[PDB]
């Protein structure tokens, strides 16, 4: 926080805001309040970094507050501020809750419109493209996890991946490491004496999904 205010250069400003949500990965709820002040900032760079931090923070364990914070950052006028917000929204609202949420359908098509628009800059279009890519990743059946829910321990692959993904402004081929952050969500039955998947049906309250189709 101290470096984000005190060090006036744009790289240093942007990095330190991104860096907070890795520290407070598990305390993802309080982050919306702390970078509330940096969302509103008169410094474009700082707001760019605000948007990535919130994406990373609430990616696998959702939270409403961030989705709301990230909406004015979409609509923020600076080119790259917008670019950052679009990519970030799809990290958070990667398939979890989307049956209790009309929001997923609305954000998805917000990406569509930006691509259709010619009047938008290339940078807004870039942000829509990649963001539409993530949303429908995996065949619409993977999620971005941040930790294993079976041991309470941060996954090596996801967290390290994220850092390589976040920087792509300065070298563009450094943007395919979010592949490692995908983990399939699915319970797979294995047979104990034939090691193959059985067909078995379980009662489940479930879960219409067609909110990114």
């Amino acid at each position: 926080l101290h470096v984000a205010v005190s060090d006036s250069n744009d790289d240093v400003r942007r990095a330190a805001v991104i860096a907070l949500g890795f520290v407070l990965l598990r305390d993802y709820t309080t982050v919306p309040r702390i970078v509330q002040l940096l969302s509103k900032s008169h410094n474009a760079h700082v707001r760019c970094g605000t948007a990535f931090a919130l994406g990373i923070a609430c990616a696998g364990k959702g939270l409403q507050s961030a989705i709301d914070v990230l909406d004015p950052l979409t609509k923020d006028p600076v080119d790259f501020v917008r670019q950052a917000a679009m990519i970030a929204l799809s990290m958070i609202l990667i398939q979890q809750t989307e049956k209790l949420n009309p929001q997923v359908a609305d954000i998805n098509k917000n990406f569509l419109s930006v691509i259709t628009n010619k009047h938008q800059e290339g940078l807004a279009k870039f942000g829509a493209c990649v963001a539409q890519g993530i949303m429908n990743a995996g065949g619409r059946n993977v999620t971005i996890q941040l930790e294993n829910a079976d041991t309470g321990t941060l996954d090596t692959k996801s967290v390290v991946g994220l850092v390589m993904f976040s920087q792509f402004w300065y070298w563009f081929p450094l943007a395919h490491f979010l592949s490692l952050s995908f983990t399939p969500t699915t319970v797979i039955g294995i047979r104990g004496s034939d090691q193959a998947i059985p067909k078995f049906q379980m009662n489940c309250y479930a879960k219409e999904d067609a909110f990114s189709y």
Partner: protein, 51 residues
């Protein structure tokens, strides 16, 4: 914070170039209009994206 951004905003637009003012004499069907600038010649010039 709002007070610093706005002063920078006042400053920003002064660095941007000036503006003018004419009156439309006639309408063109090329998606243009014919404007006559008040101390200056006629120009057929593209129109704003909001009209």
């Amino acid at each position: 914070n709002d007070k610093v951004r706005f002063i920078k905003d006042e400053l920003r637009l002064l660095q941007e170039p000036g503006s003018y003012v004419g009156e439309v004499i006639k309408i063109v069907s090329d998606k243009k209009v014919l404007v006559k600038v008040q101390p200056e010649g006629k120009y057929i010039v593209d129109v704003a994206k909001d009209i």
